[PDB]
Short mmCIF file of C-alpha atoms in Angstrom, two decimals:
data_model
loop_
_atom_site.label_atom_id
_atom_site.label_comp_id
_atom_site.label_asym_id
_atom_site.label_seq_id
_atom_site.Cartn_x
_atom_site.Cartn_y
_atom_site.Cartn_z
CA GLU A 1 88.48 10.42 22.47
CA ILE A 2 85.87 13.08 21.79
CA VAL A 3 82.29 11.79 21.80
CA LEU A 4 79.42 13.80 20.30
CA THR A 5 75.84 13.10 21.36
CA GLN A 6 72.88 14.79 19.69
CA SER A 7 69.46 15.59 21.17
CA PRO A 8 66.67 14.82 20.83
CA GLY A 9 66.57 11.62 18.80
CA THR A 10 63.39 12.54 16.99
CA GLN A 11 61.93 16.04 16.92
CA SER A 12 58.34 16.39 15.75
CA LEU A 13 57.36 19.84 14.55
CA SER A 14 55.03 21.71 12.22
CA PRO A 15 56.15 23.81 9.22
CA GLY A 16 56.81 27.31 10.54
CA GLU A 17 58.07 26.37 13.98
CA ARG A 18 61.38 27.28 15.60
CA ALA A 19 63.60 24.20 15.67
CA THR A 20 66.46 23.71 18.12
CA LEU A 21 68.83 20.77 17.81
CA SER A 22 71.53 20.09 20.39
CA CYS A 23 75.01 18.60 20.31
CA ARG A 24 76.90 17.76 23.49
CA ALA A 25 80.61 16.98 23.55
CA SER A 26 82.15 14.51 25.98
CA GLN A 27 84.98 16.97 26.33
CA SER A 28 86.00 20.47 25.19
CA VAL A 29 85.93 21.11 21.44
CA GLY A 30 89.15 22.92 20.55
CA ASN A 31 88.80 26.16 18.61
CA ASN A 32 85.03 25.61 18.30
CA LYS A 33 85.64 23.19 15.41
CA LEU A 34 82.02 22.04 15.27
CA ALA A 35 79.99 21.54 12.10
CA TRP A 36 76.34 20.89 11.24
CA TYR A 37 75.22 18.75 8.29
CA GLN A 38 71.80 18.00 6.81
CA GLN A 39 70.84 14.81 4.97
CA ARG A 40 67.62 13.79 3.22
CA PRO A 41 67.03 10.15 2.15
CA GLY A 42 68.91 9.11 -1.00
CA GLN A 43 71.14 12.17 -0.93
CA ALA A 44 74.61 13.08 0.27
CA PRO A 45 74.97 15.13 3.47
CA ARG A 46 75.07 18.93 3.16
CA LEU A 47 77.10 21.37 5.24
CA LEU A 48 74.97 23.90 7.09
CA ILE A 49 77.29 25.29 9.74
CA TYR A 50 81.06 25.31 10.28
CA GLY A 51 83.24 26.82 12.99
CA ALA A 52 80.30 26.37 15.37
CA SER A 53 78.53 29.52 14.12
CA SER A 54 79.70 30.37 10.59
CA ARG A 55 77.37 29.70 7.67
CA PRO A 56 78.56 28.94 4.12
CA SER A 57 77.21 30.88 1.15
CA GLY A 58 74.14 29.30 -0.42
CA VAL A 59 72.77 28.07 2.89
CA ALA A 60 69.53 29.80 3.93
CA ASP A 61 69.74 32.25 6.84
CA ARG A 62 67.01 30.54 8.86
CA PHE A 63 69.87 28.19 9.78
CA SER A 64 72.01 29.56 12.61
CA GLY A 65 74.54 27.94 14.93
CA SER A 66 75.81 28.73 18.40
CA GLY A 67 77.54 27.39 21.49
CA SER A 68 81.01 26.63 22.81
CA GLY A 69 83.03 24.33 25.03
CA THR A 70 80.84 21.26 25.21
CA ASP A 71 77.42 22.64 24.26
CA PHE A 72 76.40 23.51 20.71
CA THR A 73 73.03 24.35 19.21
CA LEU A 74 71.62 24.36 15.69
CA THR A 75 68.65 26.68 15.29
CA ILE A 76 66.21 26.74 12.39
CA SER A 77 64.30 30.00 12.90
CA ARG A 78 61.27 28.87 10.90
CA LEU A 79 60.95 25.31 9.53
CA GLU A 80 60.34 24.85 5.81
CA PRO A 81 59.13 21.58 4.19
CA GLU A 82 62.63 20.79 2.91
CA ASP A 83 64.17 21.30 6.37
CA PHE A 84 62.58 18.05 7.51
CA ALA A 85 65.48 15.60 7.31
CA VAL A 86 68.26 14.07 9.42
CA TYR A 87 70.88 16.32 11.03
CA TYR A 88 74.43 15.34 12.01
CA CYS A 89 76.98 17.26 14.06
CA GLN A 90 80.71 16.75 13.49
CA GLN A 91 83.96 17.43 15.34
CA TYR A 92 87.07 18.01 13.20
CA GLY A 93 89.68 19.70 15.40
CA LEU A 94 90.44 12.31 14.69
CA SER A 95 87.08 13.51 13.38
CA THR A 96 83.76 12.24 14.77
CA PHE A 97 80.03 12.47 14.05
CA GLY A 98 76.92 12.57 16.23
CA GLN A 99 74.41 9.72 16.08
CA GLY A 100 72.01 12.04 14.30
CA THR A 101 68.76 13.87 14.94
CA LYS A 102 65.71 13.38 12.75
CA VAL A 103 63.29 16.25 12.28
CA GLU A 104 59.88 15.01 11.20
CA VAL A 105 56.57 16.71 10.49
CA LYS A 106 54.15 16.52 13.42
CA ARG A 107 50.63 16.05 12.09
CA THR A 108 47.17 14.87 13.13
CA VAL A 109 46.88 11.31 14.46
CA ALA A 110 45.75 8.96 11.70
CA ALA A 111 44.78 5.31 12.10
CA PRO A 112 46.44 2.79 9.76
CA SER A 113 44.43 1.16 7.00
CA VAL A 114 45.16 -2.52 7.58
CA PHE A 115 45.19 -4.99 4.69
CA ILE A 116 46.35 -8.58 4.39
CA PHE A 117 47.50 -10.40 1.25
CA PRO A 118 47.28 -14.15 0.49
CA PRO A 119 50.20 -16.07 -1.05
CA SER A 120 49.91 -16.03 -4.84
CA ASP A 121 49.69 -19.38 -6.62
CA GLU A 122 52.77 -18.47 -8.69
CA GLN A 123 54.83 -18.43 -5.50
CA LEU A 124 53.26 -21.74 -4.48
CA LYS A 125 54.53 -23.63 -7.56
CA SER A 126 58.02 -22.80 -6.30
CA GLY A 127 57.16 -24.05 -2.83
CA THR A 128 57.26 -21.19 -0.32
CA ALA A 129 54.63 -18.90 1.24
CA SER A 130 54.71 -15.20 2.10
CA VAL A 131 51.83 -13.48 3.92
CA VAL A 132 51.96 -9.68 3.89
CA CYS A 133 50.25 -7.40 6.41
CA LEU A 134 49.93 -3.78 5.24
CA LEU A 135 49.49 -0.69 7.39
CA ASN A 136 48.63 2.13 5.02
CA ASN A 137 49.03 5.84 5.74
CA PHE A 138 49.22 6.30 9.51
CA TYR A 139 50.73 8.59 12.12
CA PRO A 140 52.66 8.46 14.41
CA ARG A 141 55.35 6.00 13.31
CA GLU A 142 55.22 3.71 16.36
CA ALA A 143 52.97 0.80 15.39
CA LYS A 144 52.73 -2.81 16.59
CA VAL A 145 52.10 -5.67 14.15
CA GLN A 146 51.40 -9.11 15.64
CA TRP A 147 51.00 -12.29 13.57
CA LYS A 148 48.52 -15.02 14.49
CA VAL A 149 48.38 -18.48 12.91
CA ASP A 150 45.29 -20.35 14.14
CA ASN A 151 45.25 -17.89 17.07
CA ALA A 152 48.84 -18.89 17.87
CA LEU A 153 51.48 -16.19 18.44
CA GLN A 154 54.36 -15.97 15.97
CA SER A 155 57.92 -14.73 16.48
CA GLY A 156 61.18 -14.67 14.53
CA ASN A 157 59.37 -15.52 11.29
CA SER A 158 58.53 -12.07 9.96
CA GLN A 159 60.43 -9.03 8.69
CA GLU A 160 58.95 -5.55 8.38
CA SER A 161 59.83 -2.29 6.66
CA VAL A 162 58.57 1.29 6.93
CA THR A 163 58.46 3.97 4.23
CA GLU A 164 59.83 7.48 4.69
CA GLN A 165 57.38 10.14 5.86
CA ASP A 166 55.11 11.06 2.94
CA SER A 167 55.71 14.46 1.36
CA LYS A 168 52.00 15.22 0.91
CA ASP A 169 50.00 13.84 3.85
CA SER A 170 53.02 13.20 6.10
CA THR A 171 51.93 9.66 6.98
CA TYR A 172 53.87 6.42 7.23
CA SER A 173 53.25 3.02 5.69
CA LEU A 174 54.36 -0.31 7.10
CA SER A 175 54.72 -3.74 5.54
CA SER A 176 55.26 -6.81 7.69
CA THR A 177 56.02 -10.00 5.80
CA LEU A 178 55.73 -13.35 7.53
CA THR A 179 57.22 -16.11 5.39
CA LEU A 180 57.34 -19.87 5.87
CA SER A 181 57.57 -23.21 4.11
CA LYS A 182 54.69 -25.11 2.52
CA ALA A 183 55.16 -27.58 5.41
CA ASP A 184 53.86 -25.23 8.14
CA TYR A 185 51.11 -24.42 5.61
CA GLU A 186 48.80 -26.27 4.69
CA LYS A 187 49.55 -27.56 8.22
CA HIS A 188 47.67 -24.43 9.29
CA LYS A 189 44.51 -22.89 7.78
CA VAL A 190 43.40 -19.42 8.96
CA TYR A 191 45.79 -16.44 8.81
CA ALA A 192 45.39 -13.17 10.66
CA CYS A 193 47.28 -10.02 11.64
CA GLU A 194 46.47 -7.87 14.66
CA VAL A 195 47.53 -4.22 14.73
CA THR A 196 48.01 -1.98 17.77
CA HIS A 197 48.25 1.79 17.26
CA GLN A 198 47.46 5.11 18.95
CA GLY A 199 44.94 5.93 16.23
CA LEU A 200 43.04 2.79 17.19
CA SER A 201 40.92 2.62 20.33
CA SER A 202 41.19 -1.16 20.10
CA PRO A 203 43.58 -3.49 18.18
CA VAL A 204 42.28 -4.05 14.63
CA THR A 205 42.56 -7.60 13.24
CA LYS A 206 42.41 -8.65 9.56
CA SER A 207 42.11 -12.28 8.45
CA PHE A 208 41.70 -14.70 5.55
CA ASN A 209 40.97 -18.44 5.28
CA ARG A 210 43.43 -20.61 3.30
CA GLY A 211 42.10 -21.50 -0.15
CA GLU A 212 38.81 -19.76 0.61
CA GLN B 1 82.07 25.20 -8.49
CA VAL B 2 83.95 22.17 -7.17
CA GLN B 3 82.34 18.92 -8.35
CA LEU B 4 83.07 15.40 -7.10
CA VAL B 5 82.23 12.31 -9.14
CA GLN B 6 82.64 8.83 -7.68
CA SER B 7 82.99 5.39 -9.24
CA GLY B 8 80.07 3.00 -9.72
CA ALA B 9 78.62 0.53 -7.22
CA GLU B 10 80.59 -2.61 -6.35
CA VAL B 11 79.71 -6.04 -4.94
CA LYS B 12 82.37 -7.93 -2.99
CA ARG B 13 82.80 -11.16 -1.02
CA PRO B 14 84.12 -11.32 2.57
CA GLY B 15 87.91 -11.11 2.80
CA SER B 16 88.33 -9.43 -0.58
CA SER B 17 89.39 -5.85 -1.32
CA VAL B 18 87.58 -2.89 -2.88
CA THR B 19 88.84 0.42 -4.30
CA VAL B 20 86.57 3.45 -4.79
CA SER B 21 87.64 6.54 -6.77
CA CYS B 22 86.67 10.22 -6.64
CA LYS B 23 87.27 12.52 -9.62
CA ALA B 24 87.64 16.10 -8.34
CA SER B 25 86.54 18.42 -11.17
CA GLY B 26 87.24 22.07 -10.31
CA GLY B 27 88.98 24.41 -7.86
CA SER B 28 92.51 23.45 -6.91
CA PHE B 29 93.12 19.81 -6.09
CA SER B 30 96.51 19.61 -4.38
CA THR B 31 96.00 22.00 -1.48
CA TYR B 32 92.74 20.86 0.12
CA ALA B 33 91.82 17.88 2.28
CA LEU B 34 89.92 14.99 0.74
CA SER B 35 88.20 12.84 3.37
CA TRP B 36 86.16 9.63 3.16
CA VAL B 37 82.95 9.11 5.11
CA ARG B 38 80.88 5.93 5.04
CA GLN B 39 77.29 5.19 6.02
CA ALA B 40 75.81 1.76 6.71
CA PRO B 41 72.12 1.38 5.71
CA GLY B 42 69.92 2.99 8.38
CA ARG B 43 72.93 4.26 10.34
CA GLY B 44 74.80 7.48 11.03
CA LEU B 45 77.88 8.97 9.40
CA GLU B 46 81.35 7.64 10.14
CA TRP B 47 84.62 9.33 9.25
CA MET B 48 87.23 6.93 7.89
CA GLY B 49 90.19 9.11 7.00
CA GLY B 50 91.60 11.93 4.92
CA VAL B 51 94.43 12.95 2.61
CA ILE B 52 95.96 16.16 1.32
CA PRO B 53 96.93 15.28 -2.29
CA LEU B 54 100.31 17.00 -1.99
CA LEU B 55 102.91 15.74 0.59
CA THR B 56 101.00 13.24 0.86
CA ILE B 57 99.61 13.31 4.43
CA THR B 58 97.00 10.77 5.52
CA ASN B 59 95.01 10.32 8.74
CA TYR B 60 92.96 7.20 9.46
CA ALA B 61 90.23 6.46 11.98
CA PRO B 62 91.56 3.98 14.59
CA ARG B 63 88.80 1.50 13.81
CA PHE B 64 90.14 1.10 10.25
CA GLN B 65 93.89 1.26 10.97
CA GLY B 66 95.91 -1.18 8.87
CA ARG B 67 92.91 -2.29 6.85
CA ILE B 68 92.62 0.96 4.89
CA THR B 69 94.66 2.95 2.36
CA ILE B 70 93.88 6.42 0.98
CA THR B 71 95.72 7.73 -2.08
CA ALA B 72 96.03 11.02 -3.96
CA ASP B 73 96.94 11.27 -7.70
CA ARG B 74 97.65 14.87 -8.69
CA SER B 75 98.10 13.88 -12.35
CA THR B 76 94.39 13.17 -12.82
CA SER B 77 92.89 15.09 -9.88
CA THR B 78 91.46 11.85 -8.49
CA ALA B 79 91.41 10.46 -4.95
CA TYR B 80 91.35 6.76 -4.05
CA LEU B 81 90.10 4.64 -1.14
CA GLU B 82 91.03 0.98 -0.72
CA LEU B 83 89.52 -1.23 1.97
CA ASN B 84 90.70 -4.84 2.29
CA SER B 85 89.57 -7.79 4.44
CA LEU B 86 85.95 -6.79 3.89
CA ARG B 87 83.12 -8.11 6.04
CA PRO B 88 79.28 -7.89 5.80
CA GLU B 89 79.11 -4.84 8.10
CA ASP B 90 81.36 -2.95 5.70
CA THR B 91 78.36 -2.97 3.37
CA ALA B 92 77.63 0.74 3.13
CA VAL B 93 77.48 3.86 1.01
CA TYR B 94 80.90 5.48 0.78
CA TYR B 95 81.07 9.24 0.27
CA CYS B 96 84.10 11.31 -0.73
CA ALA B 97 84.22 14.87 0.56
CA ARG B 98 86.47 17.90 0.03
CA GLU B 99 86.74 20.62 2.66
CA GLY B 100 85.44 24.08 1.87
CA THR B 101 87.47 27.21 1.37
CA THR B 102 87.01 30.93 1.99
CA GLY B 103 88.93 33.99 0.80
CA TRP B 104 89.46 34.11 -2.98
CA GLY B 105 88.69 31.19 -5.34
CA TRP B 106 91.08 28.24 -5.42
CA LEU B 107 93.50 30.59 -3.72
CA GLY B 108 91.80 30.34 -0.34
CA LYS B 109 92.09 29.23 3.27
CA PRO B 110 90.74 25.81 4.41
CA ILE B 111 87.90 25.70 6.94
CA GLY B 112 87.99 22.03 7.93
CA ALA B 113 84.36 21.07 7.43
CA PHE B 114 83.32 19.12 4.35
CA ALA B 115 81.65 21.66 2.08
CA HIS B 116 81.75 19.49 -1.04
CA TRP B 117 80.49 15.91 -1.39
CA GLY B 118 80.36 13.15 -3.99
CA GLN B 119 77.23 11.26 -5.02
CA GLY B 120 78.39 8.23 -3.05
CA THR B 121 79.26 4.66 -3.95
CA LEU B 122 77.23 1.69 -2.74
CA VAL B 123 79.50 -1.15 -1.67
CA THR B 124 77.76 -4.45 -0.84
CA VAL B 125 79.78 -7.16 0.92
CA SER B 126 78.05 -10.55 0.64
CA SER B 127 78.39 -14.28 0.01
CA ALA B 128 75.50 -14.24 -2.49
CA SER B 129 75.38 -14.45 -6.27
CA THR B 130 73.70 -11.96 -8.60
CA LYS B 131 70.13 -13.17 -9.12
CA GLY B 132 67.06 -11.78 -10.84
CA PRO B 133 63.94 -11.32 -8.73
CA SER B 134 60.72 -13.29 -8.74
CA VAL B 135 57.69 -11.02 -8.98
CA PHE B 136 54.56 -12.47 -7.40
CA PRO B 137 51.26 -10.52 -7.39
CA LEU B 138 49.56 -9.29 -4.25
CA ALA B 139 45.98 -9.52 -5.55
CA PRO B 140 43.22 -7.22 -4.17
CA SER B 141 40.84 -8.76 -1.62
CA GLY B 142 35.43 2.47 -1.60
CA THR B 143 39.20 2.06 -1.63
CA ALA B 144 41.03 -1.21 -2.28
CA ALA B 145 44.79 -1.84 -2.22
CA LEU B 146 46.88 -4.26 -4.29
CA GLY B 147 50.50 -4.68 -5.33
CA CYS B 148 53.57 -6.68 -6.37
CA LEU B 149 56.04 -8.63 -4.23
CA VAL B 150 59.62 -8.50 -5.51
CA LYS B 151 61.25 -11.48 -3.81
CA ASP B 152 64.73 -13.05 -3.78
CA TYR B 153 67.12 -10.80 -5.69
CA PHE B 154 70.73 -9.70 -5.39
CA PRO B 155 71.96 -7.12 -5.00
CA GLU B 156 70.35 -3.74 -4.43
CA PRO B 157 68.70 -1.82 -5.89
CA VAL B 158 65.49 -2.81 -7.69
CA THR B 159 63.11 -0.30 -9.26
CA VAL B 160 59.35 -0.78 -9.49
CA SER B 161 56.76 1.39 -11.23
CA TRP B 162 53.09 1.08 -12.11
CA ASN B 163 51.65 1.15 -15.62
CA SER B 164 55.04 2.23 -17.01
CA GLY B 165 55.16 5.36 -14.84
CA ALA B 166 51.50 6.28 -15.26
CA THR B 167 51.81 7.42 -9.48
CA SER B 168 49.07 8.34 -7.01
CA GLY B 169 48.86 6.09 -3.96
CA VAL B 170 52.08 4.30 -4.84
CA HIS B 171 54.13 2.91 -1.96
CA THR B 172 57.40 1.17 -2.76
CA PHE B 173 58.78 -0.19 0.50
CA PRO B 174 62.48 -0.33 1.42
CA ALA B 175 64.00 -3.76 0.80
CA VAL B 176 64.79 -6.05 3.72
CA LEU B 177 67.77 -8.40 3.87
CA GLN B 178 66.36 -11.87 4.37
CA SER B 179 68.12 -14.63 6.25
CA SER B 180 68.62 -16.24 2.83
CA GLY B 181 71.11 -13.51 1.93
CA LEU B 182 68.81 -12.17 -0.77
CA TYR B 183 66.71 -9.01 -0.76
CA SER B 184 62.93 -8.74 -0.84
CA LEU B 185 60.58 -5.77 -1.05
CA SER B 186 56.88 -5.07 -1.47
CA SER B 187 55.18 -2.41 -3.58
CA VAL B 188 51.54 -1.56 -2.90
CA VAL B 189 49.04 0.90 -4.36
CA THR B 190 45.60 2.19 -3.37
CA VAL B 191 42.96 2.34 -6.11
CA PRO B 192 39.15 2.73 -6.17
CA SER B 193 37.29 -0.56 -5.65
CA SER B 194 34.97 0.11 -8.58
CA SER B 195 37.89 0.16 -11.02
CA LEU B 196 39.41 -3.21 -10.17
CA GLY B 197 37.32 -5.38 -12.49
CA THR B 198 37.79 -3.05 -15.43
CA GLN B 199 41.23 -1.47 -15.07
CA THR B 200 44.53 -3.04 -16.02
CA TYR B 201 47.31 -2.65 -13.47
CA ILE B 202 50.83 -3.64 -14.48
CA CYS B 203 53.83 -3.30 -12.18
CA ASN B 204 57.17 -2.82 -13.94
CA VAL B 205 60.12 -4.34 -12.11
CA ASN B 206 63.69 -3.60 -13.17
CA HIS B 207 66.83 -5.19 -11.72
CA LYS B 208 69.81 -3.65 -13.55
CA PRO B 209 72.59 -5.63 -11.77
CA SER B 210 71.17 -8.94 -13.07
CA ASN B 211 69.88 -7.44 -16.32
CA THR B 212 66.31 -8.46 -15.47
CA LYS B 213 63.02 -6.84 -16.50
CA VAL B 214 59.60 -8.16 -15.46
CA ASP B 215 56.22 -6.54 -16.11
CA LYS B 216 53.61 -8.32 -14.02
CA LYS B 217 49.88 -7.77 -14.47
CA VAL B 218 47.92 -7.61 -11.23
CA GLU B 219 44.28 -8.43 -11.97
CA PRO B 220 41.37 -9.45 -9.77
CA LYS B 221 42.03 -12.93 -8.41
CA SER B 222 38.89 -15.07 -8.58
CA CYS B 223 37.85 -18.35 -6.94
#
């Protein structure tokens, strides 16, 4: 089997920088049958390079490809805003894909704006409770959200999702939702979420009192 | 130019079978390789197999061998992909792709790489039943944030807007698959604090698969 591994996993750059993405083959790629694809969220992949170094018509010339044997490199001479997406390399001499390389915009560190939302009464009349902790507009992506119920640590009772990198301010937003039955609540009273991030010198904690 | 149009989204139960089609409008159809590539949510690309419409030759990825069947159809210029014995991890977006060609129009030499792609077909494999969502308001506590919680719906996707499309500070989060087998997402927005007691905010939720439309007004909660 031929295995293709891409590098790095995440590349953080500023618009205008030279980008270099790598693709390593477990074994020799016959007749340099290596291709590079680009994919933005909610869109189909798009061919950028084929035959290791040949570029299709319509593809900008900032995109170049090189390499042979087991080492191949995609080079974006000068990054444009639309170049920031996920890149896949593919062998097609059984065809295989790389695990992908994301190219994101590297910007200034921004602390998350933390909010917390109480369960609405409408959701109560159906008998369940969802507390939502919001981390608005922050960078970098790596952020820790920890739930506390009466200063007691939670686990396995929350699910979180992150938005794509914003097109304007290049920040991320996170939403962690801890949900439980009306039995573990009102059996508890004060709800709080503690957030740990690089943009914070110390972990910021937001809280509300049940029914207050 | 070559254009590929795929069939609509499908929802299946484990063990059943699904067939996705790709209408190849343009170029020549019989001479060039049509491959299928799937993508699980938040995952990479995986090649499944390919077919040259003439002949008809077909290669499958070993991981799908026996479970998969790829068909031509020169009469309509349409390719077909059938996957049986489905399971939850087969839930993915399935793309159909035709290889590119160089050296005169549809009288050209194949290159091997997929230069033409379809729009993709979302195939969900679940044990759940189509259900409309419950929309509960995330009431607001400078700048203040509020929103709407779209909870318990099946399947994807659900579309949320604010004030009927009227956009700044809007964050619609990706849905998460709960342990209940249903989906749930949150949609927040940042607005000035001095507008909350005066301004009307109405989030417009739309779930096409269950034919559900809910327009929930988020107003200042008061105790």
